[PDB]
Amino acid sequence: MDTSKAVIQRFNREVIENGDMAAFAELVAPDFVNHSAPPGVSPGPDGFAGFFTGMLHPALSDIRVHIHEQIEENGKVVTRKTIEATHTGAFFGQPASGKRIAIHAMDIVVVRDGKYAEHWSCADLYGALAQIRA
Amino acid sequence: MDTSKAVIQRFNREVIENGDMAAFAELVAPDFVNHSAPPGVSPGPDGFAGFFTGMLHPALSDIRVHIHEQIEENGKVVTRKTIEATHTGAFFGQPASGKRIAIHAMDIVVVRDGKYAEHWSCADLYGALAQIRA
Numbered sequence: 001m002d003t004s005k006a007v008i009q010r011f012n013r014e015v016i017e018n019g020d021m022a023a024f025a026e027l028v029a030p031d032f033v034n035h036s037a038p039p040g041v042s043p044g045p046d047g048f049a050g051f052f053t054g055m056l057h058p059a060l061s062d063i064r065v066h067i068h069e070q071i072e073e074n075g076k077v078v079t080r081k082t083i084e085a086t087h088t089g090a091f092f093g094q095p096a097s098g099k100r101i102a103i104h105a106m107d108i109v110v111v112r113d114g115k116y117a118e119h120w121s122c123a124d125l126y127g128a129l130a131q132i133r134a
Numbered sequence: 135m136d137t138s139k140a141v142i143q144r145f146n147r148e149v150i151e152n153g154d155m156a157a158f159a160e161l162v163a164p165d166f167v168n169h170s171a172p173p174g175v176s177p178g179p180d181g182f183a184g185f186f187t188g189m190l191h192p193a194l195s196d197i198r199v200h201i202h203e204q205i206e207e208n209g210k211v212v213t214r215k216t217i218e219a220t221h222t223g224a225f226f227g228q229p230a231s232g233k234r235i236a237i238h239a240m241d242i243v244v245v246r247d248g249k250y251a252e253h254w255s256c257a258d259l260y261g262a263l264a265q266i267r268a
């Protein structure tokens with residue numbers, strides 16, 4: 001039986017790095033809520049999947065997620081990480097630059113019965129677009 | 135002798151909201167390191183104080199720090215918060231708009247002997263500048 005931290009590590013590897021949506025289905029609960037979802041997006045699992053399949057993986061190639069630290073209290077796991085990838089597609093209105101960039105992020109995940117139940121995210125887009133524009 | 139969560143709560147109220155640098159001197163250690171310090175800035179307490187006195191408080195008036203949650207493990211405290219303020223000064227290339235904006239942020243603080251010892255930050259500047267431009 002693997003830990004909440006282990007489940008988040010598996011999600012970052014199989015879903016964010018590899019883009020395995022079969023792994024997504026296995027690691028995200030049907031009652032999942034993305035509290036950080038923008039006002040126009042579905043806070044549900046389908047909205048969350050749509051961010052990876054429709055936005056992230058079309059924009060970023062050769063994704064490497066560097067998990068620096070994981071702080072856990074009361075079933076919530078804070079992951080401080082870096083998303084390193086090659087900018088090969090339009091990202092936040094920025095056309096493909098071919099540049100390898102590093103996005104600093106922090107997410108808070110609530111894992112229940114081996115699946116993602118609740119999620120909050122924070123990312124340095126200002127800095128990532130600055131990298132793209134240099 | 136108050137908790138790490140209470141020290142961070144006091145720092146956000148007296149330093150970030152009120153701009154009391156006398157409180158800064160009392161709540162930040164001399165060996166403090168800001169791991170999220172920009173490339174040209176000092177990771178030291180002097181560099182960190184300079185962010186508030188030199189860029190944050192000249193840019194933002196009537197600051198309100200809305201602390202949502204605090205997750206602690208192994209001497210690290212993650213604070214998920216929303217900085218609400220009026221844009222009255224120069225902020226990341228945007229001249230004063232007079233708008234009251236909300237900056238979503240997350241910081242990881244290591245409190246040692248009632249003072250700030252280590253710090254990591256994440257803030258939604260992309261979102262904040264978007265608000266300034268609306």
Ligand SMILES: [Cl-]
Nearest residue numbers: 016105107121
């Ligand atoms: Cl994520």
